[PDB]
From a paper:
Specifically, we examined three pH points: weakly alkaline (pH 8.0) for host cell docking, weakly acidic (pH 6.5) in the early endosome, and acidic (pH 5.0) in the late endosome. By using three-dimensional (3D) reconstruction with icosahedral symmetry, we determined cryo-EM structures of GNNV VLPs at pH 8.0, 6.5, and 5.0, as well as virions at pH 6.5 and 5.0, with overall resolutions in the range of 2.82–4.36 Å. Cryo-EM images revealed a spikier appearance of the GNNV VLPs at pH 8.0 and 6.5 than at pH 5.0. Our cryo-EM results show the protrusions on GNNV adopt erect/loose configuration at pH 8.0 and 6.5 but become prone/compact at pH 5.0. Notably, the diameter of the GNNV particle under acidic conditions (pH 5.0) was smaller (370 Å) than under weakly alkaline (pH 8.0) or neutral (pH 6.5) conditions (380 Å). Thus, our cryo-EM imaging has revealed that GNNV structures are pH-responsive for the first time, with protrusions on GNNV adopting an erect position under weakly alkaline and neutral conditions but a prone position under acidic conditions. GNNVs dock on their host cells, e.g., Grouper fin cells, under weakly alkaline conditions as wild Groupers live in relatively warm oceanic regions that exhibit weakly alkaline conditions (pH 8.1) or under neutral conditions (pH 7.0–7.5) for farmed Grouper. By mimicking those conditions encountered en route of host cell entry via the endocytic pathway, we discovered that the protrusions on the GNNV capsid adopts an erect/rising position with loose configuration at the docking condition (pH 8.0) and early endosome condition (pH 6.5), but compact and rest on the capsid shell at the late endosome condition (pH 5.0).
Author numbering:
A (entry chain B), D (entry chain B), E (entry chain A), F (entry chain A): 52 to 215
B (entry chain C), C (entry chain C): 35 to 215
The structure:
């Protein structure tokens, strides 16, 4: 077997949220999980054709004063083609969390473990396991710098160099 | 205890909804009427793509689940006409949702296809994929539907024919969500 | 066999659909924002009648069932605001769906009512009818809903308050049908 | 072994019989069983040189009103070179059936199991196992659309592309 | 069972490269491997619904004089969607070969034995195992009649009948 | 484990040698084997800190007419620092080959499987396994398009991320 197991921590997305703009339902983070976003996996997927996600956890680590107001809801939609970004969709899914802006939380979602494709294509269900969505729950009193780390572990295969 | 700057949140049972439900039923996927003389050979009577939306009770249950897998799928062709009607029918289930071929040979090639007279009711026990399929629509139909059902006329019928295609199904829904088409 | 005048029908599995499904979840029945100063005493923050339509995932499952019975029903009041907000709230669940009284006494009288500060989250474990209730709407609300939830302010709040009322429910649907509102 | 076992249902021949033309001995169906007639086996024999029939049943499925008059006799002559189409030849053979026009019957004949040739040739005994013959027994009062399905099962060999 | 193992060789593409036009990077051959491309598999796929490529190899057999100064690079990209006509992209793929214009070579690539579909659809990744690309390396001196052959061994399934 | 075995072929260098310039001792190719030189290993080393070359071979594939009178000598010096462009120095190294300009050959050298560093530094002996040298033997007659390929199999370690 020529499968290469690669794993590690990496920050998929960082967002800045100025004070007073975090209204309810505001989409702070909306990231379709593909290996291109992941820093270390971006180079590994550039040299392979297919990958299979073996572990995926999203650690939301926001950095705001403890007296800041408002909260956030984070979830992982297993369907990359789904284009719904609301509290209802997040609360429906498994692994979703809701917490105050100064709390760091962990999202352990339900993701497909089949063999996906690193490259882009017409069918998004064949390239990504899902979409991470992080929304505001209430108005934030202070500016929030939110960073979403992602502990991943994939199994690459089929060596081939690829272009952006 | 003390009075902190901000107390920790205590939302406990979030993202722990029900994950798997088994749903069963038997619904009419098609109903057709043929006035005398239109049942020419090869005329397509029923062309129904098996999707959760086609099944009414499953249509709502598929709106709260991401992926479903078909466990049981059997079709019934019930022609409600007397035993003095000429001509006949051929019914089949193409496992490929994208296969749009409407001929006698294409139907007869599939496993479980039936050929009968217009006064004989039949049951199609087809070949379908047990793999998990996506409830919501996508770019490729082969990831969302187990197949297609085709019902054709074989001979020129003599009288008006009423034909009902029923489908006994049983699916297993997984990966909870809330689809908003 | 012989050739009769008309052959007998052979529809076998008709009217034998699934009868009972247990459905569970936890959904936000209400969400309110109070700018500073509007939290006057007795001001009604949340007034939600517990019906299957109010619960999103149950709304679709109730459209294919006639009667449902509530097995578990517990509400959570989550105020997402700091620990320096004045005033407080009272939350209760009136078992009578038609009881439209919004006062502190009416809420506190009910079993399981909670009184807390705006920086304390609470859980209401109320008294609800275990009897079978009709999914579809009718002339009398007491045959279709287990009760009503009321959340009121107790004191004048100092800061803007975000309050979310979540409801952990568990129902048993019976008597299959297809409701078309 | 590179033998490919292929089997399936397929309609060899459909015939329309107008009312009043089905006199006694009329040859409704006269089909020399070669893989070209069989729809799915037509494509399989186009890519192979030799085949051996392992199972052969002919299901006659006529579609006429139940009050129609007259009957049909169906048989399978094991000799493709034989050019006799009468009730005598059919009744002599094994597996022959006789039935009213509205009855569907099954013919389980006696066929050679040797290795035949898909392509045509001078000797017809080396290419086909036999000839299906379906005749009218009496005058038919109504128009009859008769279809002869064939449950077959062959064992192909010797890969080679072929032309009509 | 419905599984029918088939194998054989077939010329997927043939190209004629006149003298002087074989500049570096020129795309001599770009052929997406589909069942219709292979003659014997073209008929096999017309009578089945699914196929899985168990074995796949290619042979480049250029037919040029021994005084033809030039070279070619050949490789099987295991992703039908990927489109990159560069030397490094081909050489990255496993089994890719580089040779002179008067030397026949064999490509033994890597690919996933996933159960593909014999009929075309919106997504090419479900109907094709990949695509063979043959490029020029250096300017050729004489006319080259290149003929890429493919030795395949596939496993058909789900009996049906189709029209292209 | 952090160890990730990778392997593949990549063209380390390509040179064009015009007619008459291939005098004896001329240095056609002098390429220091570094991870950046190999495309697929270039991305693999950008996401790791250490690598050890488990297997390393080279193939010389000159592309010249069969009437090209001349010869080449190829060899892998296992010391990056050593700098000697002489025939005897190359032939001394294990696996060195001598051939005609129209004959592809394979170099299977000797080297130490020491855990090298993927990023450049002051000492080249810690970042490169060696250097391949290809010299002329005798004056060539026609233009030669030489392309040295390298088949490598390395073992990465110490996960990290780097920029070149
Ligand atoms: Ca790709
Ligand atoms: Ca969906
Ligand atoms: Ca009702
Ligand atoms: Ca032949
Ligand atoms: Ca198809
Ligand atoms: Ca470094």
């Amino acid at each position: 077997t020529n499968d290469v197991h690669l794993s590690g921590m990496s920050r998929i997305s960082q967002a800045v949220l100025p004070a007073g703009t975090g209204t309810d339902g505001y989409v702070v983070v909306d990231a379709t999980i593909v290996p291109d976003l992941l820093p270390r996996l971006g180079h590994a997927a550039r040299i392979f054709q297919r990958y299979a996600v073996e572990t995926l956890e999203f650690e939301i680590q926001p950095m705001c004063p403890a007296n800041t107001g408002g909260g956030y809801v984070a979830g992982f939609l297993p369907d990359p083609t789904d284009n719904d970004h609301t509290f209802d969709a997040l609360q429906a899914t498994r692994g979703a969390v809701v917490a105050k802006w100064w709390e760091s939380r962990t999202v352990r979602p339900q993701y497909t473990r089949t063999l996906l494709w690193t490259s882009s294509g017409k069918e998004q269900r064949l390239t990504s396991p899902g979409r991470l969505i992080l929304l505001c729950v209430g108005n934030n009193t202070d500016v929030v710098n939110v960073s979403v780390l992602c502990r991943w572990s994939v199994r690459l295969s089929v060596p081939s160099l690829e272009t952006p």
